[PDB]
Amino acid sequence: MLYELIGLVRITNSNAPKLEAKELSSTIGKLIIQNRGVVRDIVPMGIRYLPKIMKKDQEKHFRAYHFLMLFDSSAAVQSEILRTLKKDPRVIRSSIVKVDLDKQLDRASSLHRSLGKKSILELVNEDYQSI
Amino acid sequence: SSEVQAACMTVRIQNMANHIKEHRKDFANTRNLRILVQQRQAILRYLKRDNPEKYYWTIQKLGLNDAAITDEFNMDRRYMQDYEFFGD
Amino acid sequence: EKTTLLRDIRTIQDALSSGSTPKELLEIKQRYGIQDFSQETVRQLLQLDISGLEVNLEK
Amino acid sequence: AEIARSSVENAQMRFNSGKSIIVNKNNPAESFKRLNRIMFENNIPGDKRSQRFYMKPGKVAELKRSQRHRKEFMMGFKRLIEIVKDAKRKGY
Amino acid sequence: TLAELLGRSRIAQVANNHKPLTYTGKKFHPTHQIIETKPSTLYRQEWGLKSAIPSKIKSRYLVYNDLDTLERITTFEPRGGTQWNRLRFQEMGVPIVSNIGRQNPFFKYISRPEDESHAKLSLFKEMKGDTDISPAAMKKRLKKITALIRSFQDEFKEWLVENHPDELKLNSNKLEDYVVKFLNKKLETKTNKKFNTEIIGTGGLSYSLPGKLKNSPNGVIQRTVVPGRILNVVKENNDNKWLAAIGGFVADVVFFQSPPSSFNSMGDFIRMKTFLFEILEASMEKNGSVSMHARLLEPQ
Amino acid sequence: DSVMRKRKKKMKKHKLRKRRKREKAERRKLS
Amino acid sequence: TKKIDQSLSKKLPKGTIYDPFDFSMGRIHLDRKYQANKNSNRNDIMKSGANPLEFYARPRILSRYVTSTGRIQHRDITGLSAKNQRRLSKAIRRCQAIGLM
Amino acid sequence: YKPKEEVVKYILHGKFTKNNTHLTFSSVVEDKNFHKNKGLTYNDTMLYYLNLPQKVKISLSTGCLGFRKAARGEYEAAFQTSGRMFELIKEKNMLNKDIEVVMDDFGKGRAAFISALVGKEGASVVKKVVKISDATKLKFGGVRSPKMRRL
Amino acid sequence: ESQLLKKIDKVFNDETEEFTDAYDVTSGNTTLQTQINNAIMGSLSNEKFFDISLVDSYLNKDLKNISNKIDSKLN
RNA sequence: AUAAUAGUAAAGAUGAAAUAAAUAAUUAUAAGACUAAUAUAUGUGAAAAUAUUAAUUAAAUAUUAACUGACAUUGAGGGAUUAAAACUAGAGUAGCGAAACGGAUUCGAUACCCGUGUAGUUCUAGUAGUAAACUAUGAAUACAAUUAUUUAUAUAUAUAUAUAUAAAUAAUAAAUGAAAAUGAAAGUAUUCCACCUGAAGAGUACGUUAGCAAUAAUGAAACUCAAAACAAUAGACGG
Ligand SMILES: [K+]
Ligand SMILES: [K+]
Ligand SMILES: [K+]
Ligand SMILES: [K+]
Ligand SMILES: [K+]
Ligand SMILES: [K+]
Ligand SMILES: [K+]
Ligand SMILES: [Mg+2]
Ligand SMILES: [Mg+2]
Ligand SMILES: [Mg+2]
Ligand SMILES: [Mg+2]
Ligand SMILES: [Mg+2]
Ligand SMILES: [Mg+2]
Ligand SMILES: [Mg+2]
Ligand SMILES: [Mg+2]
Ligand SMILES: [Mg+2]
Ligand SMILES: [Mg+2]
Ligand SMILES: [Mg+2]
Ligand SMILES: [Mg+2]
Ligand SMILES: [Mg+2]
Ligand SMILES: [Mg+2]
Ligand SMILES: [Mg+2]
Ligand SMILES: [Mg+2]
Ligand SMILES: [Mg+2]
């Protein structure tokens, strides 16, 4: 099944804002590819201010690095990833939504589909045939 | 053909029964399972009238017997306890 | 058999374009039964049933 | 450090609630009127009053049904009045 | 038969129109057909419609949408004022000219493919001119076309290897050119939007040909003077020209050097006074509007 | 049946409930 | 006074045709009465054919359909179809749960 | 490295219930040497400046002005209590920095407080008020309210 | 893991652009032109992302019986 | 609820009242229950029910193609599910709240209003099978005159509407009806099931079956009476 993870990582060090996000993406990506899974895309969303002050593991946060990760795995692996994210102190909020593949095998991230690009081939073919 | 319909229902019955064994309080899908099992009985009862030779061949291959098909069945609480549907 | 179709079809197309005849090919001539290594032998190793269906449907 | 000092203005107003008005030093009574409009367009006074006492779900459903009917009935009434006025203007 | 007669009846001649009779947007041209009744028929509320128009109506001109409705009334507005805008334009005797120097749309000119060198610009305009098309009916232009174009694959898999084989073995820069031409050549026979609904030229506002001089008892008229009104007392924001109301049209007025002092004096009531203007040129835009340029002739 | 008529059944049900509570109480003391 | 409130004067666009009635107060009142946000469709993503549920991670677009306090607007105000209103509300509720809106 | 407590603004909070009106005047104090402390992260600094400590200066109710029992929840009680607050803010030299008014509920004293601040009684305080806001607390489901009163 | 390390570096790099969704960025046809060309040309297409026509012509001795035909014509 | 902080002297409640370093404000911590807008319960579900988010499993739509060849309808008995309250066992217990104990009101107040608030309301595993469990309207099939409004599928184009065919809802013709009204049924017909035969006695008594229990199902007769009931009409009256 195709899944879309949206994680809000903590920005502890203002000098290295995209450090825990890179370390986290590697941890999650390794779980996926080591359990028969495929990582289709990793779309960084940048530092954004949280809608409110949020709390996690007796800590407070006002900003986080947003990142998206489109990956293919089994339901058991998807639940394992979610369990690790809900326990990691780095992760402030994490959501995994299923992306239906009943009609087509290649679906882009919701962010891209919102912009009209329905498949990764459309994104790649707009970076080769026109770039 | 009635034999094909019974076989196709058997696959779904087997899958639905496995679901119920893990979701014993899912009464909505227990009701669906009951109706599907009763539908399979109806199609096979017609087959026995239409082509008796195929009927006996079909039920033997599916693992059923004439009694399972002709006898009134309600998949009630006594059945769940006499055949240990949920185990223990 | 670690040998893969793609790799085997990449040796029958390089040996047929370079002239090399390592014993692997003889083995490949047994893995697939393709005694002769020509451009019209890889095309018959990769035939898909769909192609036959398309012609039966036209008839 | 100063990085945490020069980035507090937006941060302060980035977590807004939507129930605040910047007072117009000239006409300070116009800002209180603007705040009142927000309260009524978010039904804040009505919600607060409706949360003072518990109402049974059946009664809640009845009131919601009746209120919707009255809202739709008023829209149908206004549509018919517009037709009357237009018909009168053309001499019907 | 009765059906044949009905198709040719005067009511059938009026094209179906459901456009709002009360429109508050920007009006660039007439939207409804003006209906006129003679004085004798008006005395009897006869307009050639289904039902008698209410006697309150004293005008002899109306515009309507529906002959009858569920409300048992006719949907009409007793106005015919777009005819006076056209007749006032005729009185100003300013021919409409093309700012792009295009051929006259009212003459059957022998045109050539000079602009047809943009075959890939307009052949794809059929699928790319979908600014306001449904999200799925426009998507039906992708599979429906793909099958039609895919049915010409065999024809183009032989013509291209018989007329330009070198390109197929060297580069596709020219192959793409042969593709755009192929479809158009095989589409000119087809009828895709064979009827074009775009406004043709002036749209009927003026059928006057440029060139003629206006003879007068005081000699040939060299500059057309027309009374008008200045709407704003401050030039259009971001534009170096004010706006005037001349003959039912809003024009852009250019002043000689300075703005008359009556502007500051009058202020927002400047529209209450009438000035004399000179109509420099009149152009037609694709939206169907008329771009009238004027000049505030001031007593000197 | 109307509310008026329902009220007669209501009274009969109340008197039966009142009598059964009364009987219960006695059994408790007599037990 | 040489000044008039904008609400008491109509500015005729350039290139448009007008009637004498366009200078009256009736035109002013008539334009107020029939002033509807009909140009929203061309600027309304959710009235274009896109699935509102694909915007659950784009709070900026979703924030156009909630009040200042975050209350989802009734369909009477949004003007969306039943399906889009249903999908849009789901997107907003999901966005709120993820921690973005 | 040294406590440098300074006032940044004042908060005038009004709680307008059905039976009383409570008016609190507070000071938003900021230790201007907080960033000069050791072992302080960028997050702790930003979190300290996003919710600065507050100190209560004036606390008033309608019973402090002599209104008793049922009179405490009336319009006149709130208007006079609002005046006494606007006076005590000038008599304590607390009208130098900007004031932010926070109103809580919609009792009869809410409109009296607004009238007393947009009128003569609050002509000094109103000049310093920079932001007005509402802080009415609503519940999304939450605890069960008491049963409706049959009266 | 090699692909993962290369992807992470290329996406979380200062040079890389990140979808911050703060403004309506400005600029279909590209992907629609690849479809049109692959529908007309088919096997004899120049698109990097071709259709099954090319794979069908290969296994049907068409892309080869046409290459020889073109070359024979050139002769 | 607890703690801190400054800051004070009243606070809380009501028709008005009185009963039990505060209230208010800003922080921090803990716990249980609930689910604002959207929202129409629209829709979905056999009914009961069902609206904070995600995931897993199961079920559910339309058209087309092929296939089976009456395999269907209804359904006694039977089976399954079934709100709230109640009960058994173990956890939980913020708020609400039978009872109980107090404060008021009143001529009296075993009430309505206020306080303190136990069971219960929550979760897990069970028992029980009852509601104005209501559309007070069993299910299925064939059929009959219109309009309006949505929804869905399809078709077309001079590309955004237009034309079709279903479904839903609203108002109706006919028809039906004691009328109120029903309106695609409460119409025209067919098939199957449940149920009724004056009121009161009575859904009671007795027996039986089932349940830990409360109870649930089944379910009379005597005596007495010439009543009793529904729709609608005109009044009178209404804090
Ligand atoms: K419903
Ligand atoms: K037969
Ligand atoms: K039967
Ligand atoms: K039965
Ligand atoms: K409790
Ligand atoms: K009901
Ligand atoms: K029945
Ligand atoms: Mg059956
Ligand atoms: Mg009855
Ligand atoms: Mg009071
Ligand atoms: Mg209580
Ligand atoms: Mg407190
Ligand atoms: Mg809700
Ligand atoms: Mg419904
Ligand atoms: Mg049945
Ligand atoms: Mg217990
Ligand atoms: Mg009490
Ligand atoms: Mg049970
Ligand atoms: Mg009972
Ligand atoms: Mg019953
Ligand atoms: Mg119910
Ligand atoms: Mg059925
Ligand atoms: Mg009983
Ligand atoms: Mg009656």
Side-chain angles (χ1 to χ4, degrees):
Chain A
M1 285 83 64
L2 188 65
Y3 292 109
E4 175 177 332
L5 167 59
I6 296 181
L8 308 190
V9 188
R10 67 179 178 191
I11 304 164
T12 63
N13 184 26
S14 52
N15 309 319
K18 314 191 293 177
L19 177 53
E20 280 145 326
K22 289 179 76 177
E23 296 166 354
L24 185 67
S25 65
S26 181
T27 303
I28 303 293
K30 281 165 184 172
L31 283 164
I32 297 160
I33 66 185
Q34 293 177 337
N35 293 254
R36 305 302 304 175
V38 181
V39 179
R40 290 202 183 184
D41 193 6
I42 303 175
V43 179
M45 293 174 82
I47 302 177
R48 308 186 184 184
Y49 275 107
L50 300 175
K52 64 159 194 179
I53 296 191
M54 303 188 182
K55 298 211 293 182
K56 181 75 187 283
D57 303 353
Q58 307 301 335
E59 169 178 352
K60 302 201 308 187
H61 308 84
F62 64 89
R63 62 171 187 173
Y65 192 92
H66 296 41
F67 79 93
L68 182 149
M69 182 170 296
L70 187 74
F71 69 96
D72 265 310
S73 75
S74 67
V77 170
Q78 182 269 312
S79 67
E80 164 57 12
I81 297 162
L82 187 59
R83 180 177 316 100
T84 57
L85 289 165
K86 296 263 176 292
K87 169 182 61 174
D88 180 9
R90 291 181 295 172
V91 185
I92 302 164
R93 293 280 195 279
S94 54
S95 63
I96 300 176
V97 300
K98 180 186 174 186
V99 179
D100 193 21
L101 285 184
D102 179 19
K103 297 292 189 74
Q104 58 186 124
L105 303 160
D106 177 16
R107 301 276 301 272
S109 72
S110 61
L111 300 179
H112 293 127
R113 298 199 312 277
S114 75
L115 305 169
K117 300 298 179 172
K118 309 315 177 187
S119 69
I120 297 176
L121 183 56
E122 289 175 24
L123 294 168
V124 166
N125 178 252
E126 199 189 23
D127 290 346
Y128 168 85
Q129 204 71 2
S130 56
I131 294 184
Chain B
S1 63
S2 306
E3 52 268 29
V4 172
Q5 301 194 39
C8 296
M9 293 175 196
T10 305
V11 171
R12 290 150 53 202
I13 288 166
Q14 293 283 342
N15 180 42
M16 210 173 301
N18 181 67
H19 167 80
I20 296 303
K21 289 180 176 176
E22 295 177 351
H23 301 267
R24 73 173 66 211
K25 298 303 182 62
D26 185 330
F27 300 136
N29 290 322
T30 305
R31 175 171 175 275
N32 294 340
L33 176 49
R34 174 174 309 102
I35 295 164
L36 180 57
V37 169
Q38 292 170 336
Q39 177 177 11
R40 181 178 66 182
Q41 287 183 286
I43 200 60
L44 291 175
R45 287 167 187 166
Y46 166 81
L47 181 59
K48 191 179 184 186
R49 298 158 40 209
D50 188 66
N51 181 359
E53 183 180 354
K54 176 69 60 176
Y55 165 79
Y56 282 104
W57 177 90
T58 300
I59 63 170
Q60 180 62 20
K61 193 172 185 188
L62 292 177
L64 299 164
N65 65 5
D66 191 29
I69 306 306
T70 63
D71 296 0
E72 174 187 10
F73 187 65
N74 293 329
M75 202 182 74
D76 57 15
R77 293 168 299 190
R78 179 168 184 179
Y79 157 81
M80 304 281 196
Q81 295 176 336
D82 294 358
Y83 294 87
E84 310 182 14
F85 189 87
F86 297 109
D88 189 7
Chain C
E1 302 183 8
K2 295 185 178 181
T3 55
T4 59
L5 175 59
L6 181 68
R7 277 181 175 180
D8 303 1
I9 297 303
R10 182 168 255 181
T11 59
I12 306 153
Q13 285 190 346
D14 291 0
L16 173 59
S17 69
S18 67
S20 65
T21 58
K23 305 316 186 181
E24 75 191 0
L25 304 185
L26 176 60
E27 160 178 41
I28 291 159
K29 131 179 176 183
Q30 305 153 12
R31 303 313 198 80
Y32 300 81
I34 296 282
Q35 181 163 22
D36 305 1
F37 298 66
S38 174
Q39 293 178 336
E40 296 197 0
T41 72
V42 170
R43 195 186 321 284
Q44 315 308 321
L45 276 185
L46 304 175
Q47 292 292 349
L48 302 185
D49 300 349
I50 191 164
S51 296
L53 297 174
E54 187 166 6
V55 176
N56 190 18
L57 271 169
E58 297 161 352
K59 296 172 175 178
Chain D
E2 282 295 345
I3 59 167
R5 185 92 273 182
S6 65
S7 62
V8 178
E9 303 180 3
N10 291 337
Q12 270 164 0
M13 298 309 310
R14 276 274 168 184
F15 311 103
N16 186 25
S17 57
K19 304 176 290 162
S20 296
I21 300 281
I22 297 302
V23 177
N24 174 20
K25 295 181 179 179
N26 311 323
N27 188 359
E30 179 272 356
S31 67
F32 279 98
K33 191 174 179 175
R34 282 181 173 181
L35 189 64
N36 195 238
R37 186 181 183 85
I38 298 169
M39 298 305 93
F40 282 103
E41 295 172 346
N42 298 251
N43 193 43
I44 309 305
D47 288 351
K48 189 65 178 180
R49 291 192 297 276
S50 66
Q51 290 176 16
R52 181 181 172 193
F53 301 103
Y54 177 86
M55 183 180 296
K56 302 216 306 207
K59 300 314 200 192
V60 172
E62 279 197 344
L63 179 53
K64 173 188 259 288
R65 188 168 305 274
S66 61
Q67 284 177 0
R68 184 55 186 177
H69 169 75
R70 285 160 182 265
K71 179 172 174 189
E72 290 181 345
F73 184 103
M74 180 56 71
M75 292 190 276
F77 178 75
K78 286 174 174 212
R79 189 190 84 89
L80 278 190
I81 295 299
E82 288 174 0
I83 293 166
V84 168
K85 295 191 297 192
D86 277 316
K88 178 202 171 172
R89 184 165 55 80
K90 275 120 200 199
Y92 286 109
Chain E
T1 68
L2 185 64
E4 295 170 23
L5 295 167
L6 173 60
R8 302 196 305 273
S9 80
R10 292 197 197 189
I11 284 166
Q13 298 171 25
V14 182
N16 290 336
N17 190 3
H18 294 113
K19 292 169 186 177
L21 285 169
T22 312
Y23 181 71
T24 58
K26 296 193 185 180
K27 194 182 188 180
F28 298 120
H29 52 77
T31 62
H32 292 79
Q33 169 66 59
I34 297 167
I35 308 304
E36 173 178 40
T37 183
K38 304 187 186 158
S40 63
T41 54
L42 178 63
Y43 179 80
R44 299 160 175 86
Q45 302 174 265
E46 187 52 35
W47 290 72
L49 296 172
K50 183 273 193 291
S51 61
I53 294 297
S55 61
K56 168 180 183 174
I57 308 304
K58 303 307 176 181
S59 176
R60 288 190 314 106
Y61 307 105
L62 67 74
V63 290
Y64 75 101
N65 272 347
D66 307 295
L67 297 173
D68 199 16
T69 63
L70 174 59
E71 290 63 45
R72 299 180 175 279
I73 52 167
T74 305
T75 56
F76 75 92
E77 291 290 357
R79 304 185 290 275
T82 61
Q83 74 185 301
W84 313 127
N85 288 1
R86 176 181 51 86
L87 293 171
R88 277 160 200 164
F89 193 87
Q90 190 181 350
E91 284 199 350
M92 291 186 288
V94 177
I96 286 283
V97 292
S98 296
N99 292 6
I100 322 302
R102 307 164 180 180
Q103 301 174 12
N104 198 5
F106 297 147
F107 280 82
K108 195 175 183 172
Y109 288 117
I110 308 178
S111 306
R112 328 189 175 180
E114 305 98 350
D115 190 19
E116 182 168 336
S117 55
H118 304 83
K120 175 173 181 181
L121 177 59
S122 63
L123 174 62
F124 299 69
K125 175 181 182 179
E126 306 169 8
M127 314 167 298
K128 298 172 184 169
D130 292 343
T131 61
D132 292 346
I133 310 298
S134 200
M138 193 198 157
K139 193 184 186 180
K140 198 172 190 186
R141 313 166 171 258
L142 310 179
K143 295 178 180 179
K144 184 178 179 180
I145 299 188
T146 300
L148 177 63
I149 301 182
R150 182 161 185 179
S151 78
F152 315 138
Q153 176 169 98
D154 299 16
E155 180 174 50
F156 196 80
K157 275 181 175 175
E158 174 175 357
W159 174 96
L160 189 66
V161 297
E162 179 173 0
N163 297 38
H164 310 262
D166 304 2
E167 288 65 18
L168 271 169
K169 204 182 180 179
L170 295 169
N171 192 358
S172 64
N173 287 12
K174 298 177 184 182
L175 298 181
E176 183 178 35
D177 306 348
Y178 312 140
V179 171
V180 167
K181 183 179 179 180
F182 170 86
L183 307 165
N184 284 304
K185 176 176 180 178
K186 306 285 172 184
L187 278 161
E188 294 144 19
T189 63
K190 307 294 183 178
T191 55
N192 306 1
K193 289 182 177 180
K194 203 71 181 181
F195 281 122
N196 183 25
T197 61
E198 286 180 15
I199 296 163
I200 298 172
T202 69
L205 179 56
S206 180
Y207 296 90
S208 73
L209 291 176
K212 194 158 192 301
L213 286 165
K214 309 177 184 181
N215 213 344
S216 179
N218 193 42
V220 175
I221 306 297
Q222 316 293 334
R223 302 165 67 184
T224 304
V225 188
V226 296
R229 293 180 189 274
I230 296 289
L231 300 182
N232 54 359
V233 67
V234 179
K235 65 178 50 178
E236 313 170 39
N237 296 359
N238 306 352
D239 311 350
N240 193 11
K241 307 179 180 184
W242 297 36
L243 283 183
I246 305 178
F249 300 88
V250 176
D252 61 283
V253 63
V254 306
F255 309 79
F256 302 96
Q257 294 188 354
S258 303
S261 296
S262 63
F263 292 176
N264 306 327
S265 172
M266 302 260 289
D268 294 351
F269 297 81
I270 190 65
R271 62 182 57 187
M272 297 294 312
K273 165 177 183 187
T274 293
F275 312 99
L276 295 175
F277 298 81
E278 180 198 357
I279 307 307
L280 308 179
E281 56 151 359
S283 178
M284 198 93 183
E285 312 191 3
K286 295 181 180 181
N287 64 349
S289 75
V290 177
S291 169
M292 207 167 64
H293 307 263
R295 177 193 302 169
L296 185 67
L297 298 177
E298 194 72 16
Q300 290 145 32
Chain F
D1 57 334
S2 65
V3 182
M4 187 179 184
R5 298 174 58 201
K6 278 182 168 72
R7 284 172 40 78
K8 295 98 183 199
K9 288 174 173 297
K10 182 188 187 66
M11 179 54 66
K12 268 297 189 184
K13 183 159 186 171
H14 161 64
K15 292 156 80 137
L16 177 78
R17 174 182 186 249
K18 186 180 191 65
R19 169 164 67 82
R20 287 172 177 177
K21 169 176 167 180
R22 181 198 312 144
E23 292 174 0
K24 283 182 202 70
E26 293 165 300
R27 302 157 208 174
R28 304 192 60 180
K29 298 184 177 181
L30 303 193
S31 63
Chain G
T1 188
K2 306 175 183 177
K3 302 177 179 179
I4 308 165
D5 186 4
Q6 279 190 349
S7 69
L8 304 176
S9 176
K10 175 169 172 54
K11 303 181 178 178
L12 306 181
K14 192 272 170 179
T16 58
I17 63 184
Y18 69 89
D19 295 1
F21 169 87
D22 291 354
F23 294 116
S24 74
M25 288 286 194
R27 170 56 61 187
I28 301 297
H29 300 132
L30 198 65
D31 289 348
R32 297 166 178 174
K33 172 170 184 166
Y34 295 86
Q35 182 183 15
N37 295 3
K38 307 185 179 183
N39 302 336
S40 72
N41 185 6
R42 291 197 180 183
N43 292 336
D44 189 322
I45 299 164
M46 304 315 177
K47 297 179 178 185
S48 182
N51 180 5
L53 201 54
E54 300 187 346
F55 298 81
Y56 80 91
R58 297 190 63 194
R60 195 184 85 250
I61 308 305
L62 298 185
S63 290
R64 303 174 182 175
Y65 304 88
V66 301
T67 66
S68 53
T69 67
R71 285 167 57 91
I72 297 159
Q73 295 183 304
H74 199 274
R75 186 190 173 198
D76 290 350
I77 293 159
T78 70
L80 300 172
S81 64
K83 169 166 71 190
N84 288 324
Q85 179 74 9
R86 179 171 68 253
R87 291 172 160 194
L88 169 62
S89 62
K90 168 63 72 171
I92 290 164
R93 292 195 306 273
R94 182 191 289 178
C95 200
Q96 291 167 1
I98 294 170
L100 303 181
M101 194 162 180
Chain H
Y1 205 87
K2 162 210 171 183
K4 188 173 168 189
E5 285 184 0
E6 150 179 9
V7 171
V8 178
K9 60 181 143 178
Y10 291 99
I11 309 298
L12 174 55
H13 189 273
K15 183 159 197 190
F16 311 101
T17 69
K18 182 186 84 74
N19 293 337
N20 213 324
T21 298
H22 298 252
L23 296 180
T24 295
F25 194 76
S26 296
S27 74
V28 184
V29 183
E30 179 179 351
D31 177 4
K32 182 162 170 189
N33 297 0
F34 182 89
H35 63 74
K36 316 175 184 179
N37 189 10
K38 304 172 180 172
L40 189 55
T41 76
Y42 176 86
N43 290 336
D44 297 348
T45 300
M46 278 279 285
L47 283 180
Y48 171 89
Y49 294 139
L50 280 168
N51 191 27
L52 278 171
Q54 286 191 6
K55 287 281 182 169
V56 172
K57 297 307 180 186
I58 314 173
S59 294
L60 274 173
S61 55
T62 64
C64 294
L65 280 78
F67 297 90
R68 297 285 168 276
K69 298 296 176 187
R72 290 177 292 177
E74 302 297 62
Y75 180 99
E76 184 177 2
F79 194 87
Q80 296 193 26
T81 312
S82 300
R84 178 56 175 172
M85 172 70 70
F86 300 159
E87 288 171 0
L88 286 164
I89 293 166
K90 192 164 177 177
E91 301 163 3
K92 293 173 176 295
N93 305 327
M94 287 172 173
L95 198 54
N96 57 316
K97 295 161 183 297
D98 64 326
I99 301 167
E100 299 186 356
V101 177
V102 184
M103 297 171 293
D104 196 2
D105 193 24
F106 301 97
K108 289 182 198 161
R110 195 196 182 86
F113 169 96
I114 297 163
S115 295
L117 184 58
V118 304
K120 65 185 181 179
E121 294 78 6
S124 309
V125 172
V126 67
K127 294 171 175 177
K128 296 296 297 182
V129 174
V130 291
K131 179 175 55 171
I132 57 159
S133 70
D134 171 283
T136 315
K137 284 166 187 180
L138 291 172
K139 69 188 178 185
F140 298 167
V143 301
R144 187 184 177 103
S145 302
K147 67 202 192 182
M148 287 179 293
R149 298 175 163 174
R150 306 186 290 278
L151 293 153
Chain I
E1 297 185 28
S2 302
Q3 288 171 303
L4 186 55
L5 179 52
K6 297 168 185 182
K7 170 74 168 185
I8 288 167
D9 293 351
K10 166 174 178 182
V11 301
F12 294 106
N13 168 35
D14 296 358
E15 306 177 350
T16 299
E17 301 180 1
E18 50 196 1
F19 182 85
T20 59
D21 201 22
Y23 309 100
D24 276 318
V25 173
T26 63
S27 63
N29 307 337
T30 58
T31 61
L32 177 63
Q33 292 152 16
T34 294
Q35 291 164 30
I36 293 155
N37 299 349
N38 286 318
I40 305 161
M41 284 149 170
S43 54
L44 312 174
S45 64
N46 59 307
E47 288 293 344
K48 166 180 171 191
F49 304 132
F50 50 87
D51 283 322
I52 200 183
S53 63
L54 183 67
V55 177
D56 286 1
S57 294
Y58 167 75
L59 297 173
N60 295 337
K61 292 188 170 169
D62 172 30
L63 182 59
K64 172 166 181 171
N65 298 5
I66 192 166
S67 58
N68 306 333
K69 183 178 179 180
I70 297 176
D71 297 12
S72 62
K73 169 180 179 177
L74 300 177
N75 300 346

